[PDB]
């Protein structure tokens, strides 16, 4: 294979930064995390209690902490023999994006790639990306449900108790929010939470 000139090299390089936000952050890395966070905040019955400019940043740091092996492999085996000019761009790009796909193929559904192969180990890029976004969503929701369960239990139990305490016209939201907050902060909420996230996304 030939080698691209400097003009087209810098062209494609400056261009890739345009696709960078979507292709790196949304359909590849952590959309599950932001979906989980939005769900969870909708579960505390208080929209935008922690501002989004904190949760988004924490999600970015989390995804840079959970993509250590893939960025490691890419960095070494691509940029190490490319910063010393031993391999061509149009081939180093693929040799670097190979282990990223090897990571993708582990978090997609073990069956959905078929459901995108009909509608269409070494599956192409056109098929995997949607067949991976869909099966990242279908598990982000499956995790959000488990997150919702305990707060729903708390709300139901406090409603049943206050009803057994003989009162019908009191809104349990204000009387139950402090209990949710104290139980979530007493059980090491964010620590165990991050931990479970990294473990289910990493294993």
């Amino acid at each position: 294979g030939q080698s691209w000139s400097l003009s087209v090299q810098t062209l494609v390089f400056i261009t890739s930064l345009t696709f960078l936000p979507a292709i790196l952050l949304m359909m590849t890395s952590f959309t599950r995390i932001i979906i989980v966070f939005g769900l969870l905040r909708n579960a505390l019955g208080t929209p935008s209690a922690p501002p989004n400019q904190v949760l988004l940043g924490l999600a970015l740091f989390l995804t840079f902490f959970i993509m250590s092996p893939v960025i490691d492999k890419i960095y070494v085996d691509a940029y190490q023999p490319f910063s010393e000019q031993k391999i061509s761009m149009q081939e180093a790009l693929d040799k670097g994006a190979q282990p990223l796909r090897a990571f993708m193929l582990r978090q997609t559904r073990e069956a959905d790639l078929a459901l995108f192969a009909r509608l269409a180990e070494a599956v192409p890029m056109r098929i995997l990306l949607p067949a991976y976004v869909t099966s990242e969503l279908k598990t982000a929701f499956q995790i959000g449900f488990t997150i919702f369960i305990p707060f729903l239990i708390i709300d139901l139990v406090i409603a049943s108790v206050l009803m057994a305490l003989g009162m019908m016209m009191v809104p349990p939201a204000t009387i139950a929010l402090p209990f949710k907050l104290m139980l979530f902060v007493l059980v090491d909420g964010w620590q165990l939470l991050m931990g479970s996230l990294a473990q289910s996304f990493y294993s």
């Binding site: 691209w4 000139s5 003009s7 087209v8 062209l11 149009q90």
Partner: protein, 71 residues
């Protein structure tokens, strides 16, 4: 697919530019076969080809940007 067309365009611009460059280089060494009226034409043609390429890229990028900002 569609990435094939990207590769085709990029490796049809890069090779033209490299041919023009190696021709200019083999000329500046006095090697018999160049006449200063063939390198200028190839250089201008490579320039207009690169211009067309970056124009297509600008159009496609702006379109993909306006698409991803919908509701």
């Amino acid at each position: 697919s569609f990435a094939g067309q990207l590769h085709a365009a990029l490796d049809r611009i890069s090779d033209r530019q490299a041919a023009a460059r190696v021709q200019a280089e083999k000329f500046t060494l006095g090697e018999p076969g160049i006449a200063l009226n063939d390198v200028m034409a190839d250089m201008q043609k490579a320039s207009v080809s690169m211009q067309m390429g970056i124009q297509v890229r600008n159009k496609l990028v702006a379109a993909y940007q306006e698409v991803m900002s919908m509701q």
